[PDB]
Structure 1
Amino acid sequence: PGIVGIRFCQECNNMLYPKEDKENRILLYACRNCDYQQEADNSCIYVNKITHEVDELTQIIADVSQDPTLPRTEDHPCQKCGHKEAVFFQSHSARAEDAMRLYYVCTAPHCGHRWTE
């Protein structure tokens, strides 16, 4: 489905707003401070995830691997480069529903690969 996103006008750089073309039945975006119009490519407008199953692998930063206060195991090798050190931690996120799942971040410089088991 997609979580969609904003679009900005190209003249006054304001927020475009979705509106309906009544003649051609084509979704348009129009700034309200000028006459600028643009055709909607995505065709979805407002999308809301209530169940909100969230992918934490997107939020996790690779720099986390430098923290002394996080644990690490040589049990789980890196999936990409096959490095033994992995520094694992939990959600660290409020409103996570119920997750004790560990997320893994590969140590060694610049790898930064982030997986979940």
Structure 2
Amino acid sequence: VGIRFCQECNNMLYPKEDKENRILLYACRNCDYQQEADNSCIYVNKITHEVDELTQIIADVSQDPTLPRTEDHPCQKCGHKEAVFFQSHSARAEDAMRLYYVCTAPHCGHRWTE
């Protein structure tokens, strides 16, 4: 799923097929450095696009003076009783009115939806 760079000329390693041992070989097209593939899959295309933005929001958003705050929902990892919540603010806005939270305690940065 990732990418492979050549170890000699630092370029993009293409996948190739050899008719001897039935194993995927990654080859270069400037030099001919070789090696075998460990996962033996090339292409993947996610159309659902249901990526949870809990992996994209940053912990320093709790320094924003223009975001609402809450005393109801406390943090689990530290027990702080003050959070700051917001919406998806991104694409995939068909049914996007969820409410992600971020703890505001210094050096906690814990994030969670509900």
> TM-score scaled to structure 2, two decimals?
0.93
Q: CA deviation at 1:96?
A: 4.2
The CA distance in 2 between the partners of 1:31 and 1:67, in whole Å, is 48
Q: Shift in Å at residue 5 of structure 1?
A: 1.7
Segments of structure 1 that go 5 or more residues without pairing to the other structure are none
Q: How many residues align?
A: 114
**Cα deviation, residue 78, structure 1:** 0.6
Name the CA shift for 1:19/1:97 in 2 (closer, same or farther; >3 Å): farther
Instruction: Find the structure with the greater CA-based Rg.
Output: 2
Aligned residues: CA RMSD: 1.2
1:69-84 map, 5 Å: 69-84=66-81
> How far does residue 28 in structure 1 lie from its aligned partner after superposition?
1.5
Change (3 A) 1:48 1:97: farther
My pick for the range that moved more, 57-66 or 21-30, is 21-30
Offset at residue 22 of structure 1 (A):
1.9
Residue 96 to residue 36, structure 1, CA distance change in 2 (3 Å): farther
Aligned to 1:115: 112
TM-score (norm 1): 0.90
What does the per-residue CA deviation read over 1:75-105, in whole Å, with 9 as the maximum and x for residues that have no partner? 1111211111111111111234421111111
Q: Per-residue deviation at 1:32?
A: 1.0
Structure 1 match to 2:12 = 15
1:17 deviates by 1.1
1:50-73: per-residue Cα shift (whole Å, max 9, x none)?
011112111011111100111111
Identity of aligned residues (%): 100
Separation of aligned partners in 2, 1:97 and 1:37: 46
CA distance in 2, matches of 1:27, 1:88: 47
Q: Distance in 1 between matches of 2:16 and 2:87?
A: 43
Q: Which runs of 4+ in 1 moved over 4 A?
A: none
**Could you list the runs of 5+ residues in structure 2 that have no partner in the other structure?**
none
